[model samples]
Target: SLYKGVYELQTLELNMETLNMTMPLSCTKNNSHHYIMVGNETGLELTLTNTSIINHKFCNLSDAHKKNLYDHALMSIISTFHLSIPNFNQYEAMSCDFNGGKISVQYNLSHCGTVANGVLQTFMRMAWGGSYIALDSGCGNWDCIMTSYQYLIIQNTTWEDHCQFSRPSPIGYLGLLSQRTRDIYISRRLL
Candidate 1:
């Protein structure tokens, strides 16, 4: 609120950072009621309430909450193997085009157990194959070459119904799962 505003964006600030919006925006406070005001050079003003930000289930879960979940997930894997944490990847998808005013996340797994749990393996067995969903036709590609994983963990439902990827050793992005789901979600190598 008092930090910045959505001034204008077909896709607003990628993340919470004020500069991420790619516009000249500013937020300030009013002494009268102490409400946070957000707007930009265009004179587009909007008021924000701490109420909604506080009550939302996942309010900015891009940090601690998410770290906690990942920790639990990692605990499962390390406990399975012997140990593991460190970026563990060549890349990470930060600041995506969160199209809707809403943020979305999805999960799916490959290999189907603990092998996929920690992250990756090379010169591995064929048991850890991925899915080739019906979606390839619409999305303009496939996730292979040993499965390119054309955005396997999708957000929108339209794509959700069409995707078909392989199994899991342990996980995918496994994005929006709750404690209950995470507790029970498991994978197995296919016969």
Candidate 2:
């Protein structure tokens, strides 16, 4: 059976410069404690305990502890992927709007080809681990083309409804899963 943890997203910070997101959460397992999960252009982590420039500390995460918090932390935050104004003739780009906050993106899509379903699903899963759902705003207004703008949203699911399958694939930015980095929680796909 999959383990469960009680955690809430206390704060979410999306860094446009580094293209990474920091999610601070309050968790209650055997005892109540804090955790920081970061998801960058690459992947997410439970964070390491460390002292900062002047004086600060980040807690450590054991492999098992990470496994416990990974999904719970992810589900605590919401994720939305937008394919704003898609073009049928040309590859259409998309951006990720997370936790009702800022947005960031890396690649584009053409039809269901190249990297559409898999890429969008993976990104949304990473941002907010839950069931996959997409919204299409009908067909475009062009005569020769028939593509519509889309918003892929990942919403929370009941504990029983959560994915029992193996963990999702990495973010795999640029369609290169091989180039992604390994993290404390999510596994990396090697070339």
Candidate 3:
């Protein structure tokens, strides 16, 4: 089984045109600044890079202000469904570095597949609304069906662009769960 706390962060790039300045427009906008959307099964993270948010005010937001931004980000992720998903607690504003402009939100889940299925589906469903492109490799490898798609997130009253990534299905990750069940059955038959 894949151990806990070993998942790598899959990332997607953010651009200026699509990710408009949610903050004041007076701040410098370098031609190629980017925000990184780093994600795993349990959490999705947003981080500003380089001159992406050169404005000190954005990096120095108050705790209450950060919560508001997190609320915007979370809703932007789920607004496609027309129903609010409860709790900004998932945003982890207390632990997140708003000063550094890093906002991350996590989902509560026990296993990678069933638990993560709901959260990832919400993100993917948003992607489908804008665009859903599949990146397929040779089927000989389970990674063949991996996907990379971009979607929009509204933050601070402007449309901010982001992307959602992929992971191999749970059964495809490791055969342990099903294999263990079969082994148990085989031992019972011999008895």
Candidate 4:
């Protein structure tokens, strides 16, 4: 996003060899004057333009954070492979329009597994405009886990409703085991 506006810079002389400066320097469109005039103790006068005197401050993210994020993603891929889990061959692309304050993420699974014995896992955080909102989506085997402070909050387990299984059977008996075990220690954090 970019913003445009006019500014002024001013300086006040209090005593010899001492001066106070103020910015942004004010400019008048009626007079078409946007320069600052300075007189030194030796009677030397100088005119400074608006573009030359003002300074801009900016905050930039470090590459370390980007590298850490990439490493984390690689670790997840390696972990998935080590577990011998079925890989999702689908790809998704997301875009955000800051001017409209809207974001959209869309993807399609080319060979999605049936609902029976298959879980759609998703980890997300709640963000407002840019704040954390809530995680609500399907990833693979983990479903609807909230993301907070680098933690995953498992909200619920998905069942294979379309499976032809007997009644009163354990979820594992139906081959519905979660690829990752639930963490009891962090379960209390959800509440």
Q: Give RMSD to native, each candidate.
A: 22.1, 19.4, 19.5, 28.4
TM-score for each of the candidates: 0.19, 0.22, 0.25, 0.15
Output the number of the TM-score-best candidate. 3
**Model 1 lDDT tens row, 106-169:** 1121322332222222111111223222112223222122222312221211111111222122
Candidate 1 vs candidate 3: the TM-score winner is 3
**Could you give candidate 4's per-residue lDDT for residues 11-96 as a string of tens digits?**
69533112212111111111111111121111111111222211222212233334443223223322332132233322121111
| 1 against 4, candidate with superior lDDT | 1
Clash counts per candidate, in order, are 18, 2, 0, 18
Ranking by TM-score: 3, 2, 1, 4
Worst 10 contiguous positions by lDDT, candidate 1: 31-40
Residue 164, model 2, lDDT: 30
Query: Any runs in candidate 2 off by more than 4 Å, and if so which?
Result: 1-92, 95-111, 127-129, 133-149, 152-191
Which predicted model would earn the best lDDT? 2
Task: Kindly list the per-residue Cα lDDT of model 2 for residues 1-191, writing each as its tens digit.
Answer: 33355654465855322323443211111110111123432222211112112121222223324455334444333221222122212223332223222222223333443344444444433323222222121334122321232332223222221113223322322232332332112224772
> Where in model 3 is the C-alpha error above 4 Å?
1-62, 65-97, 100-113, 130-191
Whose lDDT is higher: candidate 1's or candidate 2's?
2
C-alpha-based local distance difference test score of model 3: 0.27
